[PDB]
Design a protein around this ligand. Structure first.
Ligand code: ZPZ
Ligand code: CL
Ligand code: CL
Length: 375
């Protein structure tokens, strides 16, 4: 009975290979499953046969498709695609009750982008126009939705790991979280860039300079699976996580994501692995808060009577990426109207009877305006 009830439970995932929402494009309607990605800013849909796609967009059957007569290519950290730009009517049947004319890239060729078995056929880039291809003149979908309709300029995501979740567009649903929401500023509107001001592994501060945790940016990115950390931070965090979980030894490759470890169904010794906290800059001077995840968020299942896991914190050379490993702990509010991102503990996050993910505050942290990187 909350007012946003019909958007609850509108996301699915097939064996953990990306969270997607149904979107209906063109006229008469063509509904496709679209991956939700807050790490990019193009709306693009498979528009030609591919071995991994069950369905694709057929422009010649949509009477409202308009050709913008321009190609587009988008490379990501993983994979890339190429296609043709146009516009068409778009609605989200378990989203807001509106229809907008949005730009759409029709994917005609791709490399290592579509994932076999994932059940999604396109991508919804929810970040800002600064990072869209071919350039920032190509209005992203959520910008079209806010400009064309009354829908408030905010959306929130609850990614429920193991796969489903909720994308609430235009508000917050209080059933999806417990405790209070705590907000960090969006530093700049391009990616959803935030500032991380301290990192702890089981209560123990990693003690790096905060400028290392944000070198060269820290972003919130639902289309990236892992928590990705810059080189020096990743090396330092692995050394600390190893030291904390030293009652069991694992091969070096397990911490590089190259070996899996499996336990008999139901027996994974979660308690031997530490919690991990990131402190983020708060909304008042000198004030911060911390979000804490469990090994149930950073050890991810790979699908016998065997539970196999991959360690899903990994190295980046393009900054901190708070991917699904972070987002599955939390209900995350992308309050674009107030230029801030809110975290609360997710009502669906995976935990055990001893430990829960957490969002706590306030803490005092001085000189946070010096943590960010300057281009
Ligand atoms: C604007 C810019 O240039 C850009 C932005 N991004 C980050 C985007 O989120 C892109 C979007 C995307 C979505 C599907 C397939 C390929 C790429 N994401 C990635 O580049 C990406 C995508 C993935 C990936 O497997 N994503 C899948 C769909 C996924 C699977 C589970 C899940 F919970 C969430 C996402 C993994 C990674 N890594 C490098 S990793 C092993 O460290 O987690 C990166 N990269 N470059
Ligand atoms: Cl129609
Ligand atoms: Cl990434």
């Amino acid at each position: 009975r909350g007012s946003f009830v019909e958007m609850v439970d509108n996301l699915r995932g097939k064996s953990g290979q990306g969270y997607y929402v149904e979107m209906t494009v063109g006229s008469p309607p063509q509904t496709l499953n679209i991956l939700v990605d807050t790490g990019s800013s193009n709306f693009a849909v498979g528009a030609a046969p591919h071995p991994f796609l069950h369905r694709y967009y057929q422009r010649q059957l949509s009477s409202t498709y308009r050709d913008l007569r321009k190609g587009v290519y988008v490379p990501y950290t993983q994979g890339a695609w190429a296609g043709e730009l146009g516009t068409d009517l778009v609605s989200i049947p378990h989203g807001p009750n509106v229809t907008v004319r949005a730009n759409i890239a029709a994917i005609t060729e791709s490399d290592k982008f579509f994932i076999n078995g994932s059940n999604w056929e396109g991508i919804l880039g929810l970040a800002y126009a600064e990072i869209a291809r071919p350039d920032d003149s190509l209005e992203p979908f959520f910008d079209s939705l806010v400009k064309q309709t009354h829908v408030p300029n905010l959306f929130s995501l609850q990614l429920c790991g193991a796969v489903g979740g909720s994308m609430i567009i235009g508000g917050i649903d209080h059933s999806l979280y417990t405790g209070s929401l705590w907000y960090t500023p969006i530093r700049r509107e391009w990616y959803y860039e935030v500032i991380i001001v301290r990192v702890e592994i089981n209560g123990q501060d990693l003690k790096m300079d905060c400028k290392e945790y944000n070198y060269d940016k820290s972003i919130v990115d639902s289309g990236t699976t892992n928590l990705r950390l810059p080189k020096k931070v990743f090396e330092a965090a692995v050394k600390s996580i190893k030291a904390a979980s030293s009652t069991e030894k694992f091969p070096d490759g397990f911490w590089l994501g190259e070996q899996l470890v499996c336990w008999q169904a139901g027996t994974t010794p979660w308690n031997i692995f530490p919690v991990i906290s990131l402190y983020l800059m708060g909304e008042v001077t000198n004030q911060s808060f911390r979000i804490t995840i469990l090994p149930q968020q950073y050890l991810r299942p790979v699908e016998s009577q065997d539970d196999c896991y991959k360690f899903a914190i990994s190295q980046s050379s393009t900054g901190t990426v708070m991917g699904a490993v972070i987002m599955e702990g939390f209900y995350v509010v992308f309050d674009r109207a107030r230029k801030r991102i809110g975290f609360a503990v997710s009502a669906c996050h995976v935990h055990d009877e001893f430990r829960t993910a957490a969002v706590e505050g306030p803490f005092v942290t001085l000189d946070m305006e010096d943590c960010g990187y300057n281009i």
